[PDB]
Amino acid sequence: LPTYRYPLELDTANNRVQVADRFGMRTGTWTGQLQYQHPQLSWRANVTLNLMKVDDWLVLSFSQMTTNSIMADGKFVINFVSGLSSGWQTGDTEPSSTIDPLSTTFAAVQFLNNGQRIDAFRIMGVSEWTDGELEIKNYGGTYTGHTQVYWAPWTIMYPCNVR
Amino acid sequence: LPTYRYPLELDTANNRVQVADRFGMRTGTWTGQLQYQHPQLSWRANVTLNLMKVDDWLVLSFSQMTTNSIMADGKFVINFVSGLSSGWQTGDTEPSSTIDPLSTTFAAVQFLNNGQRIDAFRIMGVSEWTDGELEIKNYGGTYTGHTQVYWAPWTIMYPCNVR
Amino acid sequence: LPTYRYPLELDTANNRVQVADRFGMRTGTWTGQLQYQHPQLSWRANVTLNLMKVDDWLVLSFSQMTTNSIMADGKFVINFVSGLSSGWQTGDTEPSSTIDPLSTTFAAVQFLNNGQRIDAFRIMGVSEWTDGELEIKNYGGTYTGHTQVYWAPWTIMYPCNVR
Amino acid sequence: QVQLKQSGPGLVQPSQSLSITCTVSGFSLTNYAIHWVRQSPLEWLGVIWSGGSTDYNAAFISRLSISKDNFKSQVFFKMNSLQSNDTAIYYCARKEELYGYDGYLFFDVWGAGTTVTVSSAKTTAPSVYPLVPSVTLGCLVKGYFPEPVTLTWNSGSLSSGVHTFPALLQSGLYTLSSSVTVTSNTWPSQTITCNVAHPASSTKVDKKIE
Amino acid sequence: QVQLKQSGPGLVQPSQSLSITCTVSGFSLTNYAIHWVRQSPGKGLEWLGVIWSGGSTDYNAAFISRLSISKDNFKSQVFFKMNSLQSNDTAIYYCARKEELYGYDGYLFFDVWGAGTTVTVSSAKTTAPSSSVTLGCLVKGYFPEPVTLTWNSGSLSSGVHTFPALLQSGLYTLSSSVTVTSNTWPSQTITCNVAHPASSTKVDK
Amino acid sequence: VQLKQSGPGLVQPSQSLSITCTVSGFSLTNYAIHWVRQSPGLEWLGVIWSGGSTDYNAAFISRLSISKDNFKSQVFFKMNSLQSNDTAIYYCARKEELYGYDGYLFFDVWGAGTTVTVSSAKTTAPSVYPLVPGCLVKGYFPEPVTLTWNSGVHTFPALLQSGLYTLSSSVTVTSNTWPSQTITCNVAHPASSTKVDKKIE
Amino acid sequence: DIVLTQSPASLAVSLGQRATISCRASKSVSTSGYSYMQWYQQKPGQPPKLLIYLASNLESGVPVRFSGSGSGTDFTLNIHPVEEEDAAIYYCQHSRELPPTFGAGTKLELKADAAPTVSIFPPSSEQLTSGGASVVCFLNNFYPKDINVKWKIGVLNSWTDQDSKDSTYSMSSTLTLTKDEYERHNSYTCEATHKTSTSPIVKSF
Amino acid sequence: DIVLTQSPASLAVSLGQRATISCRASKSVSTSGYSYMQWYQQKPGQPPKLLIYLASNLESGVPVRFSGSGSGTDFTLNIHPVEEEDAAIYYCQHSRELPPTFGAGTKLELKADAAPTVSIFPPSSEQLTSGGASVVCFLNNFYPKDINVKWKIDGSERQNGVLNSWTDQDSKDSTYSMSSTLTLTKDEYERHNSYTCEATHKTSTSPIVKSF
Amino acid sequence: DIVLTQSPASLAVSLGQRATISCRASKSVSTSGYSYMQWYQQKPGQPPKLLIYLASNLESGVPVRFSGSGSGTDFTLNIHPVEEEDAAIYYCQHSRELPPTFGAGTKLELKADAAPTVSIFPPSSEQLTSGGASVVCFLNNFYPKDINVKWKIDGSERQNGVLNSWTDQDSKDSTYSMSSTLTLTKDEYERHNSYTCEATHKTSTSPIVKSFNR
């Protein structure tokens, strides 16, 4: 007699109600330029991150990358207005809360200074989402003067309950 | 003729069964004193933490804070018997398992020693829940003699199926 | 009169539809040999890790352990074909995506070199799952010459949609 | 209002204790560190960190002591031994305590300062005299105590066209002059009153141009 | 400092004249034009009259012969006078000022507004007013409106909630409450003062 | 190590289809060159042994003959009396001639092959038209036409309506990436030897 | 004359979403390429603050969040970043005609949801000396705005305009009973049913 | 003249799942303990490359994932790691008899699910000089492989003149693509105004449509 | 410890012309690509207001014109738009070492030229009742700052009992002010009837003088 709202659905073929399969895992990719922002330094790097929607959590999977030098602190801005793979809309990345931070993770890096690679770490937090732009703050970490940063793979996730 | 148990609910207005909206995101705050415990050192700091109930996970969001000095190891105790915002009960923070640790995360810190800030990292693990007291163990990290610690924002989550 | 697919179940005793209790928390243990792999160095260590199935995430909870020396990079291989506790099948550890990495976390370690313990951190990512063998890559971190490693407790999780 | 004010004796005898107390109204002292600097004809003396830890100047240790009260939002400075050299305007300065790498040894906001003069001579009360000739009226003070005097025209109602002259030291007493310019129609129409409150002699004189 | 103050009777009997004086501080009266606007419930913000710098006056088309405006520039005062008030005219009245420049500023707007006077046209006589923890401050039977409450001399601006007035039969009812931490309350004493413009009174119990 | 085949694309009914294979990876005097025909099943027709010996398919004997050239490393195969039944791509395949026990009837490398069509029809050239917001060619006899595009290179098979084949090619880029780089399509016909690389706008 | 009416009358908007208010004028308020329009932000209990003058000009000290566009016949006001500060009423005003006319007004509500908080307080001892017993029940920070309180043993309930920072309404309830009949009843109950939870959070003395 | 027939005709398997192909022979191809069997990998449009020769022998440059085992009467190959690259058709061949006949080919399709992508393009100017107007609507990276495209011009339905082209399952993407082109003579091309491209798909019942 | 020295001690610049102040440090205050220095504007009688934090960063509410650039060893700030507001003294401070040391102060003087204005005022009656007579003459809005005031009693000039005050360079006006006061006891005050104050300046060789006799 009653109907069912997503993620609940009625399988008319077997007359069985179930949780949608995509609710458990929905993969995708965002292709675009990763924006680093700091008052004294700002650059853009071409990156491709993998996205997977698991329950009400959106996971960002950063592959290995080499970027220009960065400040001891900074913000990373990912503009989801464009670049999402087929099936994804810009709204599908909006968090379900405004709490700051939504989640924090650590990223492994090597700072290049006059031919020496120095192992260091960067704390990263999901902090702000404004009209499709995701703001990931880099609060700080171990730092040294460097010319460019080599970023290890790293993942970060935050709650998202949108479709 | 069947009924529905949370998070499943029957929308009688539209004769539709759905998953409750609060199941995906339920926010709150705990205001109180964060208790640091070590045999040779113990102090209390006034803190306000953001809470997020996402599915069967409870998220703890620590904002930036400055606390007294700590030992190379230590315990963090958050007493949820009081301080939770409206709508939250003490039982709503009880984990769904006794496994130790339930989850581990890293916190970025600055040790202040004789006028110098030294970058370090501090590991935190959800270890014990006793009668509304959450025990977050600090296993260790890079350490140096210091006068006070500056804590970057950081989040930690553990499974919770209470409500 | 429809039926219900897991995690949805019909409580015939009360004629009520609910989400299965095990969906929120399903505990277990894997007992076996932890395989470290690097072209110039490989060893096996007897470990017992706790497993918990929370929603579509499988959480691996590593307790403290002491292992042989490791290279600056390396792979950790956990063979789930055998060693899972009762009720668990090898398939129950298969991730719901092939994205690499599925999730990354940091591990706190102490490198032992000529009677001195040096604090360092180790980044770990869930990277591959092959016919019951879970491959956790160690991309890198702060490193120093050492004879033995002391590992702090740490947890890592990745999306998993199997029973 | 995020403002901080400190109270303390203006003049201290040689080998006496110079103590100034700094009061915070806009910021919680548990999040900010309060510093102390002295400007002599600017020297950093000491800082109390949030949480009670104190660090002092290397060359001033054991002669200055700093304490703070967070429940009362106060920072207390006490100096034990005074010389002729340590005469200066002393200021309490503020720094936020954040994890960010802002290069923390800096001062965001500065309190008024307390004027510290090192002299064993007693405080004498200042004499306020009104001088009358657009029209300009001048107010002069002679025979003043060692603390300085803030001259307030119309309780601070009018600030433009008002020149205040710094103190001049004659025979162990200070001479202060102030002048205000107003339209010829204004002054005989509305009354102008000059008030000079002295903090060291506990005197407040409210003179009228008449 | 720019300040605008209005002085005038709070309540006027039916068919009486409401006269308010608006005084400007810091503003050059020779450089600014002062307008008059009233806020009426259901009728909305109504523009009534303006004094241009130099004494020229233009009034609302629908309010001529009931409104008159005068000013004195040497004393920095503007005088507002209405001839007849009816229940229709119960409204908050405002005096607003605009600069006098040759520039094409599109001048018929108001940059700065006075605090305004609450005008009620009632025949009834003036009546005299009578981890955390919450005490309420209430005044009852105060005609006409408003009552200005300054708690602890305005020490704390956060955590101060004020509830609007409710009109009883011949009495006005205002209730106000503060919530503060339980630990903080036993430390310092808190005094609630509520000033009424018709009856000079500050009661701190 | 590559082998090259040259031959007419379309042969009329009852005509002779002859294809020649040129080898660059191995001296043909040491290797055996086979011949297999792929029809919409797979039929094995004949094999040339090292030393000028030929053995043919049991049911296909009288129509297939194969020859070889040792000084130039070339192999000639010719089939007579072609009918509607046999229309298919022909391949040259090699197996090394060793004493080893590995089954001599398997093929290590196939160098090149020519697609054989039985309907007789004059050669038609496909004008290639590039759509801009893809390069497409329609109506060429005989198939196939070699189009070389520039991941992100998709080619669609020919569709035969009224004796004509249609070829489509597409490239996908984001709208912001569209004005940045140009892509040029060249379409070579083996019967007409004409290649057009022009692009509009 | 020249009447303008904005649309809509009340606007309930979510944060980080641009809110468009449309003001339509009977006659063209734009002249010679200039549009003579003004927008105002009215804080609770405060005079209106000018936001935008002419058509695309922001008044001094106004954040970029506020934006307006339109010609004489129709004007729109837009605010994409909407923080807690913008809980005020907005009016549109024209500068063309000799009598300027203010708009009807649009009420803007930033949307949030939270559980209520109930607090009960007994009557005063100093009030007991007067001869009247009055009990006040104060509920702060509840959303949605609709909450009903039923007292069972002359009941008055008040609601504060939507809070600026909290963005959650508050409620005040007062009831008065004479001493002779006040002690005649011994039971006192406060009830507050809400939409967040069907059960009422209630405190009684 | 010993002919072999495989089972099954088509095997649709998911990545990392073992796929077993069975080839059955009329007569025993094994001699003296040696089994003369061969497997080939025929990429779309390209000739087959030999994978396995005799019994369980891997040709040079063949990945370890591909493996086959079996006796003379019938041979089976099983492959647990199945990545994206091996999406081509595979045939079985016997070397015992003097005339070898290849077994029935089997095509393997890797299964995934993703939304389609539709693109519409107007006709060319140079073709207009020829006298015929032809518009092409291109659909790339659509799964499942079954997609139908219905074209309607100015409310007149005609089934003649529509051509659709399917590409074999992509190697890396592993998502099919589809192209549809229709031709109309200049005299009748301008007689119709409305042009619609419609793609009703199994991913979403709503059609992703682009019109010119 | 860590000593800083500014250059120069006094800077005479006209409005809208950049005046550059160089702060040189005994040791490099820059570490790991960051420079830990701060600049302050201390108005006359007011505490210093922070201008720049770290290197080249403007504090909230600070004019955009103020800018400084430099490496660890020495730091310089140049300010091309110089309005009337920024006429105060500037200090440089380093944040690297545990004891932060303020640099030597640098004094900026905005350049203007204008004729002087003299005003004379008789003594107060309430002061005469006290028993001492003191007369104060203020000359306001004159540039340059150097003005001399002569006190005369019955045509006889006496410097004893005279106190003179100079005001720091005015912000808006950009013209200094002067105060001259002389005190004489009642018994000898009435013996002389003539009183004049004279102020010769560089604008005009003639002295602008106002005198009163009573």
Spatial separation of the C-alpha atoms in residues E139 and F17, rounded to whole Å: 112
Sign of dihedral through CA atoms E137, E141, E145, E147? negative
Question: Two tokens at D14?
Answer: 């040689």
Question: Two tokens at D159?
Answer: 């600030």
* CATH code linked to domain C1-163: 2.60.90.20
Nearest CA to A139 out of B107, I53, B59 is that of B107
Question: Two tokens at G11?
Answer: 């606007």
Contact C17, C48 (CB under 8 A): no
Phi, psi of E87 (to 5 degrees): -45, -25
Q: Which chain A residues are within 8 Å of B158, Cβ to Cβ?
A: none
Q: Facing residues of E58 across strands?
A: E50
**Residue pairs spanning A and H at CB distance below 8 A:** 8
Task: Write out the DSSP string of G52-114.
Answer: EETTTEEPTT--TTEEEEE-SSEEEEEESS--TT--SEEEEEE-SSSS--B---EEEEE---B
State the alpha helices, DSSP H only, in F125-186.
none
Spatial separation of the C-alpha atoms in residues I98 and I78, rounded to whole Å: 28
Q: Which chain A residues are within 8 Å of F175, Cβ to Cβ?
A: 82
Give me the residues of C, 46-75, that contact B with CB < 8 A: 50, 52, 54-55, 59, 61, 63-64
3-class state of residue F136 by DSSP: strand
- B81 Rama sector, left if φ>0, alpha if ψ -120 to 50, beta otherwise: alpha
Sign of dihedral through CA atoms A33, A35, A36, A42? positive
Question: Two tokens at H41?
Answer: 């990998």
Are the beta carbons of A145 and I32 separated by less than 8 Å? yes
Phi, psi of F71 (to 5 degrees): -75, -30
Spatial separation of the C-alpha atoms in residues G123 and G136, rounded to whole Å: 7
Spatial separation of the C-alpha atoms in residues B75 and B126, rounded to whole Å: 10
Please tell me the distance in Å from G63's CA to the nearest CA on chain B: 27
Q: Which chain A residues are within 8 Å of F174, Cβ to Cβ?
A: 31, 82-83
Spatial separation of the C-alpha atoms in residues A79 and A97, rounded to whole Å: 19
Phi, psi of H95 (to 5 degrees): -110, 5
Determination technique for this PDB entry?
X-ray
Instruction: Inform me whether the C-beta atom of residue B119 falls under 8 Å from chain A C-beta atoms.
Output: yes
Q: Which of C131, C133, C134, C135 to mutate against chain H (most H CBs within 10 Å)? A: C131
β-strand pairing of G106-110 with G10-13: parallel
Q: Which amino acid would we find at residue G24? A: R
- CA separation, residue C57 to residues A60, B19, E142 (Å): 15, 19, 64
Segment holding B21, helix H or strand E: helix B21-24
Are the beta carbons of A130 and G16 separated by less than 8 Å? yes
Q: Which chain A residues are within 8 Å of G80, Cβ to Cβ?
A: 131
Spatial separation of the C-alpha atoms in residues G163 and G169, rounded to whole Å: 6
Nearest CA to B16 out of A1, H111, H87, G196 is that of A1
- Touching status, chains B and G (3+ beta-carbon pairs under 8 Å): yes
Spatial separation of the C-alpha atoms in residues H189 and H103, rounded to whole Å: 49
- B149 Rama sector, left if φ>0, alpha if ψ -120 to 50, beta otherwise: beta
Task: Write out the DSSP string of E92-158.
Answer: EEEEEEEE--SS----SS-SEE---EEEB---SPPB----EEEEEEEEE--BSS--EEEEGGGT--T
Question: Two tokens at B119?
Answer: 């970058």
Please tell me the distance in Å from G112's CA to the nearest CA on chain E: 18
Please tell me the distance in Å from I36's CA to the nearest CA on chain B: 12
| Chain C partners (3+ C-beta pairs within 8 A) | A, B, H
Task: Write out the DSSP string of I90-129.
Answer: EEEEE-SSSS--BPPPEEEEE---B--EEEE-PPPHHHHH
Task: Write out the DSSP string of G12-63.
Answer: EE-TTS-EEEEEEESS--EETTEE-EEEEEE-TTSPEEEEEETTTEEPTT--
Sign of dihedral through CA atoms D181, D183, D188, D189? negative
Nearest CA to B153 out of B49, B28, B26 is that of B49
Exposure of F186 by Cβ count < 10 A (0-12 exposed, 13-18 middle, 19+ buried)? middle
Nearest CA to G109 out of G205, G14, G3, G194 is that of G14
Q: Which chain A residues are within 8 Å of B25, Cβ to Cβ?
A: 56, 96-97, 159, 161
Contact C11, C23 (CB under 8 A): no
* Cis preceding-peptide flag for G8 (omega within 30 of 0): yes
Within its chain, how far is the Cα of G189 from the centroid?
A: 29
What per-residue string of b and e applies to I155-188 under the rule 16 or more CB within 10 Å gives b? eeeeeebbbbbebbbbeebbbbbbbbbbbbeeee
Contact E6, E22 (CB under 8 A): yes
Q: Facing residues of B159 across strands?
A: B57
* Cis preceding-peptide flag for E144 (omega within 30 of 0): yes
Domain residue spans in chain E?
1-123, 124-205
Spatial separation of the C-alpha atoms in residues H90 and H107, rounded to whole Å: 6
Which class does domain E124-205 fall in?
mainly beta
Nearest CA to E173 out of E141, E149, E150, E203 is that of E141
Are the beta carbons of B147 and D49 separated by less than 8 Å? yes
CA angle in degrees (0–180, nearest 5) for D30-D36-D40 = 165
C-beta neighbour count of F139 within 10 angstroms: 20
The nearest alpha carbon in chain F to H138 belongs to F170
Within its chain, how far is the Cα of E169 from the centroid?
A: 24
Spatial separation of the C-alpha atoms in residues I68 and G102, rounded to whole Å: 49
Of G104, G105, G172, the CB nearest to E163: G172
Domains belonging to chain H, first-starting first, are: 6-111 (2.60.40.10), 112-212 (2.60.40.10)
Domain residue spans in chain B?
1-163
The nearest alpha carbon in chain H to C98 belongs to H15
Beta strand residue intervals within C97-145, DSSP E:
103-113, 116-130, 133-140
| Chain B partners (3+ C-beta pairs within 8 A) | A, C, D, E, G, I
Sign of dihedral through CA atoms G71, G73, G76, G77? positive
Segment holding B26, helix H or strand E: strand B26-38
Contact E174, E140 (CB under 8 A): yes
Contact E85, E40 (CB under 8 A): no
Spatial separation of the C-alpha atoms in residues C52 and C55, rounded to whole Å: 10
Phi, psi of A129 (to 5 degrees): -140, 115
Spatial separation of the C-alpha atoms in residues B132 and B93, rounded to whole Å: 7
> I68: which residues sit within 8 A by CB, 6+ positions away?
I37, I39, I52, I55, I56, I75, I76, I77, I78
Q: CA gyration radius for chain I?
A: 23
Are the beta carbons of G59 and E176 separated by less than 8 Å? no
What per-residue string of b and e applies to A42-68 under the rule 16 or more CB within 10 Å gives b? eeeeebebbbbbbbbbbbbbbeebebe
Give me the residues of A, 90-119, that contact I with CB < 8 A: none
3-class state of residue I132 by DSSP: strand
What is the fold of D121-210? Immunoglobulin-like (2.60.40)
Phi, psi of F167 (to 5 degrees): -120, 135
Spatial separation of the C-alpha atoms in residues E4 and D21, rounded to whole Å: 38
Please tell me the distance in Å from B82's CA to the nearest CA on chain E: 8
Kindly list the residues of chain B whose beta carbon comes within 8 Å of any beta carbon in chain E.
Answer: 31-32, 82-83
Nearest CA to H75 out of H165, H4, H150, H1 is that of H4
Largest CA distance in chain B: 72
Q: Facing residues of G193 across strands?
A: G148
Please tell me the distance in Å from E14's CA to the nearest CA on chain G: 25
The nearest alpha carbon in chain H to F136 belongs to H136
Please tell me the distance in Å from H16's CA to the nearest CA on chain F: 23
Nearest CA to I57 out of I46, I68, I65, I47 is that of I68
The nearest alpha carbon in chain C to A153 belongs to C101
Nearest CA to I101 out of I10, I29, I7, I19 is that of I29
The nearest alpha carbon in chain I to D92 belongs to I47
- CA separation, residue C96 to residues A23, A26, B54, G135 (Å): 11, 9, 20, 61
Q: Which chain B residues are within 8 Å of A101, Cβ to Cβ?
A: 61, 153-155
Contact G67, G79 (CB under 8 A): yes
Place of tokens 């002679």: D142
Q: Which chain C residues are within 8 Å of H113, Cβ to Cβ?
A: none
**Residue pairs spanning A and D at CB distance below 8 A:** 9
The CA-based dihedral angle spanning residues I184, I188, I194, I198, taken in that order and rounded to the nearest 10 degrees: -30
- The CB-side HSE value for B81 (13 A sphere, CA atoms) comes to 6
Within its chain, how far is the Cα of I170 from the centroid?
A: 7
Largest CA distance in chain C: 72
Q: Which amino acid would we find at residue H12? A: A
Exposure of H84 by Cβ count < 10 A (0-12 exposed, 13-18 middle, 19+ buried)? middle
Are the beta carbons of F200 and H54 separated by less than 8 Å? no
Q: CA gyration radius for chain A?
A: 19
Resolution (A): 3.7
Are the beta carbons of E177 and G1 separated by less than 8 Å? no
Segment holding E39, helix H or strand E: strand E32-40
Q: Facing residues of A151 across strands?
A: A65, A109
Spatial separation of the C-alpha atoms in residues I83 and E53, rounded to whole Å: 32
The CA-based dihedral angle spanning residues C83, C87, C89, C94, taken in that order and rounded to the nearest 10 degrees: -100
Question: Two tokens at I135?
Answer: 């007369």
Contact H100, F44 (CB under 8 A): yes
Please tell me the distance in Å from A94's CA to the nearest CA on chain B: 13
State the alpha helices, DSSP H only, in C16-147.
21-24
Instruction: Inform me whether the C-beta atom of residue B86 falls under 8 Å from chain G C-beta atoms.
Output: yes
H, E, C per residue of chain A: CCEECCCEEEECCCCEEEECHHHHCEEEEEEEEEEEEECCEEEEEEEEEEEEEECCEEEEEECCEEEECCCCCEEEEEECCCCECCCCCHHHHCCCCCCCCCEEEEEEEEEEECCEEEEEEEEEEEEEEECCEEEEEEEEECCCCCCEEEECCEEEEEECCCC
Give me the residues of E, 109-168, that contact G with CB < 8 A: 109-111, 113-116, 130, 134-136, 138, 140, 161-166, 168
Q: Which chain D residues are within 8 Å of E74, Cβ to Cβ?
A: 185, 189
Are the beta carbons of A59 and C96 separated by less than 8 Å? no
- CA separation, residue F47 to residues F5, F32, I99 (Å): 16, 7, 94
Spatial separation of the C-alpha atoms in residues E159 and H81, rounded to whole Å: 65
* CATH code linked to domain F121-201: 2.60.40.10
Q: Which chain G residues are within 8 Å of A130, Cβ to Cβ?
A: 16, 81
What per-residue string of b and e applies to A100-130 under the rule 16 or more CB within 10 Å gives b? ebbbbbbbbbbbbeeeeeebbbbbbbbbbbe
Segment holding B127, helix H or strand E: strand B116-130
Question: Two tokens at H153?
Answer: 């011009």
Question: Two tokens at C2?
Answer: 């429809």
Instruction: Inform me whether the C-beta atom of residue E74 falls under 8 Å from chain D C-beta atoms.
Output: yes
Are the beta carbons of F156 and H163 separated by less than 8 Å? no
- Touching status, chains C and F (3+ beta-carbon pairs under 8 Å): no
Instruction: Inform me whether the C-beta atom of residue H35 falls under 8 Å from chain F C-beta atoms.
Output: no
> C8: which residues sit within 8 A by CB, 6+ positions away?
A8, A17, A18, A19, B8, C17, C18, C19, C20
β-strand pairing of D114-118 with F42-49: unpaired
Q: CA gyration radius for chain D?
A: 20
Q: Which chain F residues are within 8 Å of H179, Cβ to Cβ?
A: 156, 168, 170
- Touching status, chains H and G (3+ beta-carbon pairs under 8 Å): no
β-strand pairing of B16-19 with A3-4: parallel
